[PDB]
Amino acid sequence: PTAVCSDGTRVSNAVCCDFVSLGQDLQSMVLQGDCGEDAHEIIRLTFHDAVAISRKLGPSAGGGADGSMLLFPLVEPEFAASNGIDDSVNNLIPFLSLHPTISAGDLVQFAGAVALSNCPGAPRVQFLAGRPNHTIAAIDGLIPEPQDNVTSILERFDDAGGFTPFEVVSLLASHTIARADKVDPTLDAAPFDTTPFTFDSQIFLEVLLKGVGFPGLDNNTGEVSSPLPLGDTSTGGKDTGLMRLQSDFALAHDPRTACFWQGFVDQQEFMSQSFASAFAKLAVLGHNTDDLIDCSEVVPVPKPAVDKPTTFPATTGPQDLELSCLAERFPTLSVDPGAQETLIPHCSDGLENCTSVQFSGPATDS
Numbered sequence: 001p002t003a004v005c006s007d008g009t010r011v012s013n014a015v016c017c018d019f020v021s022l023g024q025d026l027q028s029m030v031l032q033g034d035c036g037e038d039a040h041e042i043i044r045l046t047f048h049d050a051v052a053i054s055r056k057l058g059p060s061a062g063g064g065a066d067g068s069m070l071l072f073p074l075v076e077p078e079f080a081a082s083n084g085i086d087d088s089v090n091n092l093i094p095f096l097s098l099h100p101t102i103s104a105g106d107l108v109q110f111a112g113a114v115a116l117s118n119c120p121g122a123p124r125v126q127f128l129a130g131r132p133n134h135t136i137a138a139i140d141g142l143i144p145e146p147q148d149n150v151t152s153i154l155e156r157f158d159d160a161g162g163f164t165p166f167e168v169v170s171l172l173a174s175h176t177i178a179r180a181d182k183v184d185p186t187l188d189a190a191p192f193d194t195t196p197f198t199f200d201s202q203i204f205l206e207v208l209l210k211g212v213g214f215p216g217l218d219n220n221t222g223e224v225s226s227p228l229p230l231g232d233t234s235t236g237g238k239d240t241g242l243m244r245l246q247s248d249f250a251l252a253h254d255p256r257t258a259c260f261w262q263g264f265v266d267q268q269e270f271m272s273q274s275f276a277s278a279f280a281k282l283a284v285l286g287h288n289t290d291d292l293i294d295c296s297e298v299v300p301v302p303k304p305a306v307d308k309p310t311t312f313p314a315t316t317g318p319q320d321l322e323l324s325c326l327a328e329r330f331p332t333l334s335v336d337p338g339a340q341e342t343l344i345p346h347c348s349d350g351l352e353n354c355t356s357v358q359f360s361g362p363a364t365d366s
């Protein structure tokens with residue numbers, strides 16, 4: 001039955017009210033209302049937690065969205081595929097004792113939902129609560145890596161939870177606010193698109209441009225040529241150049257996924273709604289939704305989509321595109337004016353000096 005929360009929010013179940021203070025503490029203590037470094041890592045973690053599950057291997061291989069990353073921080077976060085996930089894990093662990101009525105599985109997914117709401121253009125995702133507070137650590141090998149090919153990627157997602165190629169491409173819209181710290185051992189926070197603090201479709205457009213060089217080394221596993229490789233890192237700046245993942249390039253050109261990939265270019269609402277549907281399905285892996293309760297009302301209303309249309313970054317244009325999709329014409333778009341590449345800002349405020357919250361904790365990396 002209904003209750004109103006202490007903030008005035010009408011909920012279908014007063015148990016949802018516990019998440020209100022959790023949301024406030026996640027913002028005040030870690031996310032700081034920003035679509036920044038900490039938010040991005042927490043969103044990455046929702047995926048690393050959820051995807052470790054296998055229909056063909058059965059329940060013993062992993063329980064999916066179960067908080068296994070937080071409850072066993074000495075196991076999965078140190079598997080090679082999750083190198084660097086320690087940051088988000090360590091940031092979330094303290095919230096387990098601060099909010100003891102909330103399971104680790106609920107914590108991970110609610111944190112992801114709140115983090116998403118900080119990103120302009122992101123959908124207000126569904127949030128179901130009631131994941132059990134106990135599980136065991138998943139086995140290794142369940143998380144896709146950027147060097148994997150499309151067949152492998154699609155098989156893993158289908159084996160994890162019956163995801164279609166469309167849902168896989170939809171989930172990868174998340175790379176619109178994604179950067180890499182471990183892919184290149186010489187680079188920190190190399191962004192996958194020119195707007196890593198904006199949930200827009202630039203990622204879909206920019207992976208389709210011809211690659212011209214690298215932001216760092218030229219032979220990292222899982223990385224391919226980038227269309228906008230230059231930054232100011234060679235002179236001590238923090239604006240790293242753009243990085244392209246092999247897996248994103250492969251999804252953009254494979255016959256099973258290429259039309260879905262291009263279909264999101266300049267389609268803000270279609271992209272954000274598609275990501276939301278596939279993400280809601282990701283968030284309840286390992287669970288029957290019948291055993292969960294709907295607490296979507298306590299997910300914050302997200303920052304609205306930006307005014308800016310989808311455009312070619314400075315120095316690029318349609319003549320630079322490598323197209324693979326015959327079913328739909330690539331749209332006519334404007335080109336950002338400028339004779340040289342525009343540095344991609346290290347921080348959502350346009351500067352380079354922002355800092356992020358990092359709690360110390362048991363999870364580690366290399």
Ligand code: HEM
Pocket residue numbers: 037040041043044047084144145146147153171172174175177178179180181182183184222245247279
């Ligand atoms: C084929 C599947 C995927 C591959 C191969 C992949 C790969 C990667 C890699 C290599 C990084 C860089 C990590 C680093 O070096 O620091 C990354 C970051 C990230 N991933 Fe993906 N990922 C996949 C799917 C997903 C999904 C399904 C989501 C969420 C729904 C997601 C969300 C993110 C986010 C938000 C970041 C940025 C973290 C940050 O900037 O702090 N990824 N991913």
Ligand SMILES: [Ca+2]
Pocket residue numbers: 048049050051052062063064065066067068069138
């Ligand atoms: Ca898990």
Ligand SMILES: [Ca+2]
Pocket residue numbers: 175176177193194195196197198199200201202203
């Ligand atoms: Ca973006």
